[PDB]
Amino acid sequence: MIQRTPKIQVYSRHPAENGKSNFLNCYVSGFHPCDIEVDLLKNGERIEKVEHSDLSFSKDWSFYLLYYTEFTPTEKDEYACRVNHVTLSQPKIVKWDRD
Amino acid sequence: MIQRTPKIQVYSRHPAENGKSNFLNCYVSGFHPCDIEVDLLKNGERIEKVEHSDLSFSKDWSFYLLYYTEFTPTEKDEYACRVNHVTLSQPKIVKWDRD
């Protein structure tokens, strides 16, 4: 019933190797309420065709959600996850750290 | 982004036969926002140990959720689903109709 911020984790399925296909993930967890906005960013631009899990919840009413997309890294491409939620004073951008 | 009421469907896996195990379902669908309260009722009392699906959503941001429980009907037991949601002026109780 009380608001709780999301934990935000941005990570790839494998370590970044340029020119090899991979999956980019944004896992948002432990939040309340369920209303949340999650985008994956490529060089600061929203990625349009992104996949997501369902929104799961535990008996303490905390929520869990994953956004992800197949992608091929190149050295100069930068990726991030942008989250907005009522508990956040500003939308949060968390960068993908390749290593 | 606009609020939309849930559709509420209450149904059993098989037609009610007293003394035989069954599953009771409350499927709540097409709603927005995601914040929702769903209870299964036995003779007007909340059933405590109930199972649920995850909350799924389509690209139009409508949500879908199922609550369910294994149960054994007897002739006099009455079952229902109680839903509360911001779009509802009162909590809604939808009865299970055995046939």
Swiss-Prot record, chains A, B:
Maturation and modification: Glycation of Ile-2 is observed in long-term hemodialysis patients.
Any one annotated GO CC term: extracellular region
UniProt modified residues of type Pyrrolidone carboxylic acid: 3
Keywords carried by this UniProt record: Amyloid, Amyloidosis, Disease variant, Disulfide bond, Glycation, Glycoprotein, Immunity, Immunoglobulin domain, MHC I, Pyrrolidone carboxylic acid, Secreted, Signal
Localization per record: Secreted; Cell surface
Domain named Ig-like C1-type: residues: 6-94
Residues glycosylated per entry: 2, 20, 42, 49, 59, 92, 95
Effect seen on changing residue 60 to P: Increases tendency towards amyloid formation
Disulphide bridges: 26-81
Gene Ontology molecular function, alphabetical: identical protein binding; MHC class II protein complex binding; peptide antigen binding; protein homodimerization activity; structural molecule activity
Biological process annotations from GO: amyloid fibril formation; antigen processing and presentation of endogenous peptide antigen via MHC class I; antigen processing and presentation of exogenous peptide antigen via MHC class II; antigen processing and presentation of exogenous protein antigen via MHC class Ib, TAP-dependent; cellular response to iron ion; cellular response to iron(III) ion; cellular response to nicotine; intracellular iron ion homeostasis
Resulting phenotype, residue 77 to N: In AMYLD6; reduced stability; in contrast to the wild-type, the mutant aggregates into fibrils with classic amyloid-like properties under physiologic solvent conditions
Function of the molecule: Component of the class I major histocompatibility complex (MHC). Involved in the presentation of peptide antigens to the immune system. Exogenously applied M.tuberculosis EsxA or EsxA-EsxB (or EsxA expressed in host) binds B2M and decreases its export to the cell surface (total protein levels do not change), probably leading to defects in class I antigen presentation.
Disorder this protein is connected to according to its UniProt record: Immunodeficiency 43: A disorder characterized by marked reduction in serum concentrations of immunoglobulins and albumin, and hypoproteinemia due to hypercatabolism. Patients may suffer from recurrent respiratory tract infections and severe skin disease.
Subunit relationships: Heterodimer of an alpha chain and a beta chain. Beta-2-microglobulin is the beta-chain of major histocompatibility complex class I molecules. Polymers of beta 2-microglobulin can be found in tissues from patients on long-term hemodialysis. B2M alone (not in complex with HLA-I) interacts with M.tuberculosis EsxA (ESAT-6) and an EsxA-EsxB (CFP-10) complex; the tripartite complex can be detected in the host endoplasmic reticulum. The B2M-EsxA complex can be detected in patients with pleural tuberculosis and is stable from pH 4.0 to 8.0 and in the presence of 2M NaCl.
Family: Belongs to the beta-2-microglobulin family.
Protein name listed in UniProt: Beta-2-microglobulin
Organism: Homo sapiens (Human)
Gene, per the UniProt record: B2M
Parent-protein residues present: 21 to 118 of 119
